[PDB]
Symmetry: C3
Subunit: 533 residues, 3 copies
């Protein structure tokens, strides 16, 4: 086998150049395809050219930052020194300018829009005051992260809701997801036949969850998700000054679920402080996964609003966590350790797809079993309350009626008008007690009722609410927080970090309340930026 030996020696001698040449040939072929498509027709091939240009730009940027980090840091250093030297007097000027800008924006936009947006701003202030008053360590509050998170939320709201470029970009991004969720019909029709639409939810919606889980697993294998998570987490860390671990987990929670987000920093969980653990739990409670976004879109909820709320939740979660439970210890983990995210054990893309598919079985089973149990309990409770109510000549007593009054003040502070606050209170109660699926189902019912165009009041009962109220409800309901998800979170986090069982249990309720408050703050900003039609 002399030929085999010679071939092996050749491969060993120049292994690096051979694979590099192969990759270069593949890249050249792709570029040739792109240029040929552009030559044949440019308007038709524009999106491919844009994607290629942005990919090349990001690759070059990443390479340059990796290679010239020290030089750039040294070049930036003198400016930082001068700014530190002049900061003692420049801070007052900067703060005064920011306050003046806030006042001018309020006076010239919010007052023009109407009273409800001013009420939204007041509700944001009140939620922040309430969070501060019931803080774990009111005297140890570091105010930089809170104001920076609120400012980042406000900037995102202005960019996405008050500008044509951002509005078009997010409308397009939402429209793409609707196209993407339709592909699961191919599998659903085969597995469940052409009559799979006879049982809409079980045989059409859950397959969307399965497909999205599979796609998320494939993306995680490809490493794009860690790239985006690192970008957003670095932005938050440099702006808000938060710890690398909590910043990374908050950025990840935008896409990944509550129970699978901490796995990004699993090795370092035992050494985190109490504040970081509370922030991790708050971020988990304040966002929704990407697996269960197609399910919400299928009901009829706006995709653009869901994406915007998911993006805005992370800074809100971090700010509310820092205000509610400020840091009183020294963080141990560093940026390099936090940013490295151990990828899963998948040998190839198809194995990653199969692993993502397999994991969805438990998720889709629980999603249906919990819904069955909660809807049965709701029907039983409504019947029991009607039975009790009839003894006072009030057989209309129900869970919805009680929620309409208990949670109305929370909806009013978010900027919902008086009439629609009682309807939003019912959704708030549904989310708080059972889960977000039950609340989004009712929200989709109301959206469809409005879109039909029928009478708004029948026998004195309001049938649907305004579109701004619907948007505010969508922002408020975008989370994983409910009184029934505390046990699974505690169990999973203890399983990842058994030594920290005592600490995990202590802050879980505060993290859940912080998540709800962060969702309400995002809803407050959305309400204060939207206009009354």
């Amino acid at each position: 086998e002399r030929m085999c030996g010679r071939m092996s020696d050749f491969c060993r001698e120049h292994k690096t150049t051979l694979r590099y040449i192969i990759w270069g040939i593949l890249i050249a072929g792709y570029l040739a395809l792109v240029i040929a498509a552009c030559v044949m027709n440019f308007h038709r091939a524009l999106p491919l050219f844009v994607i290629t240009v942005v990919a090349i730009f990001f690759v070059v940027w990443d390479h340059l930052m990796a290679k010239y980090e020290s030089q750039i840091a040294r070049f930036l250093s003198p400016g930082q020194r001068l700014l530190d030297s002049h900061w003692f007097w420049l801070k007052w000027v900067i703060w005064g300018c920011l306050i003046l800008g806030v006042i001018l924006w309020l006076v010239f936009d919010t007052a023009k829009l109407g009273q409800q947006q001013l009420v939204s701003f007041g509700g944001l202030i009140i939620y922040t005051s309430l969070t501060f008053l019931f803080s774990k360590h009111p005297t140890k509050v570091y105010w930089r992260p809170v104001f920076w998170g609120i400012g980042l939320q406000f900037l995102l709201g202005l960019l996405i809701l008050r500008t044509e470029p951002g509005f078009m970009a997010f409308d397009w991004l939402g429209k793409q997801v609707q196209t993407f969720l339709g592909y699961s019909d191919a599998g659903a029709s085969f597995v469940f036949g052409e009559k799979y639409t006879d049982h809409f939810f079980a045989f059409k919606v859950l397959p969307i969850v399965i497909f999205f889980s599979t796609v998320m697993s494939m993306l995680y294998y490809l490493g794009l998700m860690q790239w985006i998570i690192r970008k957003v987490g670095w932005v938050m860390l440099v702006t808000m000054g938060t710890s690398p671990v909590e910043s990374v987990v908050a950025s990840g929670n935008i896409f990944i679920g509550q129970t699978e987000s901490p796995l990004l920093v699993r090795p370092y969980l035992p050494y985190v402080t109490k504040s970081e653990l509370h922030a991790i739990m708050t971020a988990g409670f304040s966002t929704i996964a990407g697996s269960v976004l197609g399910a919400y879109i299928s009901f009829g909820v706006s995709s653009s609003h869901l994406l915007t709320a998911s993006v805005m939740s992370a800074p809100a979660a971090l700010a509310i966590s820092k205000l509610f439970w400020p840091e009183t210890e020294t963080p141990k983990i560093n940026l390099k350790n936090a940013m490295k995210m151990e990828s899963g054990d998948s040998r190839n893309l198809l194995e990653a797809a199969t692993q993502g598919a397999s994991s969805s079985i438990s998720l889709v089973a629980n999603i249906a079993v919990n819904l069955i149990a909660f809807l049965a309990l709701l029907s039983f409770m409504n019947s029991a309350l009607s039975w009790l109510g009839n003894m006072f000549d009030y057989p209309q007593l129900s869970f919805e009626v009680i929620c309409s009054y208990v949670f109305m003040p929370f909806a009013f502070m978010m900027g919902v008008d008086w009439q629609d606050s009682f309807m939003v209170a019912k959704l708030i109660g549904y989310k708080t007690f059972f889960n977000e699926f039950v609340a989004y189902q009712q929200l989709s019912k109301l959206i469809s009722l409005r879109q039909v165009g029928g009478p708004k009041f029948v026998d004195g009962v309001q049938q649907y609410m305004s579109m701004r109220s619907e948007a505010i409800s969508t922002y408020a309901l975008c989370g994983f927080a409910n009184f029934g998800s505390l046990g699974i979170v505690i169990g999973g986090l203890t399983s990842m970090a058994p030594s920290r069982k005592r600490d995990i249990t202590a802050g879980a309720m505060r993290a859940l309340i912080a998540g709800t408050i962060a969702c309400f703050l995002t809803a407050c900003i959305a309400g204060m930026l939207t206009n009354t039609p």
Copy 2:
């Protein structure tokens, strides 16, 4: 934060009085609601008043027993001493009176009712004799528990089947469960659509199991189930003189499945004796779980009879366990240890509901798969026996035909008339060989056929049986005793108590036979108390 410190000091100083005052205010509000409902209309608010009165009575009784236990015991002591002093001669008088009462009841009721009830009594005697003859230690039999269990069964049968108060109470209780099982339709319609009735069993019956599991978990969290179990177990322990652990497990098995009832005494399992272990297994085999009651009621089986058999099974299970495998060791566990039941790790009611919901997944999956496999095996066996039978010009040979003859003597001793004994034998075989679900499905088929009113014989084949025979079959079929559950029972019990693997395996078959015999004894009593229409 001086105000925060002062508030914390105030809370710490008088924590006990603050929560007590809050609870008192809640109780006062509830009482105000009840009295207002009664004032506005009394006949309409009667059940609420009754529930409040019984709850207050039980709370006061429990408090008094807890506080004045020593005083009551001391007050009772002299009477016990006098009774012990005179017992050597009073025992013959008491036993003679009981025997005379039994004879008088037989002569003046059973003979009047007909021959079949005398046959039921003879079958009860024969089953007890057979249990004694094949006993593990025939010379070590303690006869108090056997006679006390039989007497308690007879008293329960007289109270429930032969008196208007008990009959009305149990009919009402059964009717309430039928209303309760309808609530799962709310979840079933949403998850599976409005066409969920196109697949009746999978999309309507199993959700009832899920909802019942959720409700049972919520009740166990609330602690009412332990209260009722403790009451019934104390009654049995004081009457039959059984060990606290076995009494508690028998009482619990009325509501809880065989595989979860032992969890009530999990810490003390390693120290139980062989007789207690056999009694635990017999009780598990002799009763059903509350989660599957809804499916049986949905098939069409009488709810009142199911509840009565479930209640009567526990004393029968304990008596048959004690007779078949009497105690030859010294029990180690005491009443206080047996009665304390470590509750689950649920932080709030909604978490308990979600945990109950999640557990039901495997239950329903196993039920569906087992039914599919058993029905396919039944069809294959029937086809194979028809193929074999045709070689003797008897192509009618089938599993049902063989069962009609093999198990007919067991049905006849239970008091079923000659014609219907062969039909009950088929149900007995179905239960013995596959499970109680198929036997109850066939029983529901027969009940529906009778209720239609069609011809009783078509081409010489009997289509349905009498209602007394149906009741006797319902009593006989109430149990999880089948050859296929021996493996799972042994696995679960060994998992709870690994050290006792050798002992668990030894008595499992005897416990299964004891459970079947206990079910047959309950059927015998039901038959001897029912009348021929």
Copy 3:
């Protein structure tokens, strides 16, 4: 209890004779039934008589071989010595005779049949040459197993495809399975109602898998499967000279899935060599399981061809494993250790049935979820490729179009004609990239399209292929070899043998390629033996 003591003493004294007498009485009863059936009518009772005769013959044969092994070996020894003495010169005569026979068969059959069978033979030669060239140790090849496996495949093909007895036997065997898979409808109708056919795959096909899993578990409990596996494994071991462990695992893989076949030799896995491990993995990848045979038959794939491919795969798998990764170590395990197969922990037949039923839950769930995910990914990829293709005025670009050209050379070497090679390439790609379920679904689509009789070309697109091409595709697609199962295979094998994790990972890809090559070799033989209609 003197009577009980005497009975126990009697039972202990003559335990062996009592059970032997009972078994003899049962056997006498069975023989009486058989003889009576034969007397009443012989033609009607013929199959029962045949089954009884074959069972008696096999029992007597097994007893004689067990009892007289040493005597038979000694009697055979002198002939072996003479053959060894004369082998140095007789080997050339034997090899020349075999080569002449091969040449004569080629010239007088293959040339007559047509060019395509000669191309199949050339493809077999090319596949063997390619396997040799890329071998792990090309200089350590032991050529006995390769030639013996190829000869055994050729003999099986001649017996089953070129003789009336074998053809009738295998057609009958396939027809029996079609009858057997119909029994699951009894359970499916009850669990899913009479409308279970509204969702054909989920509510009719998976229950077949459940029933087949249950039947396989019952057979494994009964010990017939080990009997057959031992017979086939001894045949392969004596002919090919393979190690006992690899022979036993290859024989078992004919009926058992890749993930459960190694459990037959679980205790001895840690001491196997690298070559044996590679052979185990190749055998697992080169065959299908009996649980999924029913689904494939339900789709419309020929049952006889599936059975023949499953039988032929084992020698092909072993030969390709030995050629690709030859043995360079000393095997430690012996025949006696390999042949003993520790049975499962099932106390009775019904418990075995329930355990087989329970295991099927994850199998069917994973099948359904993987199918949904793969079909959704296929639809998304087809849409993306159409979007990319339209930029070159070729919107017809698709995954199928690319596969039709990428894998066409593999199909052509198997003997498929030029036109149908492109269609077989699509099925090859489907199997390689997602699984064998989708490829078989497409094959059933094509088979139905051919069986309808419509036009073969519509607008220049071929609709269906010849029946010989369908048979070759059926042979080629019989295997669990796909990129997505590498992870689960490695995980399961490491779980069984944690110490061998490093060795398991190294050879998994080579074992998958060897399995694919073995499937292609079986397809090559099937093509070279079939005729063009």
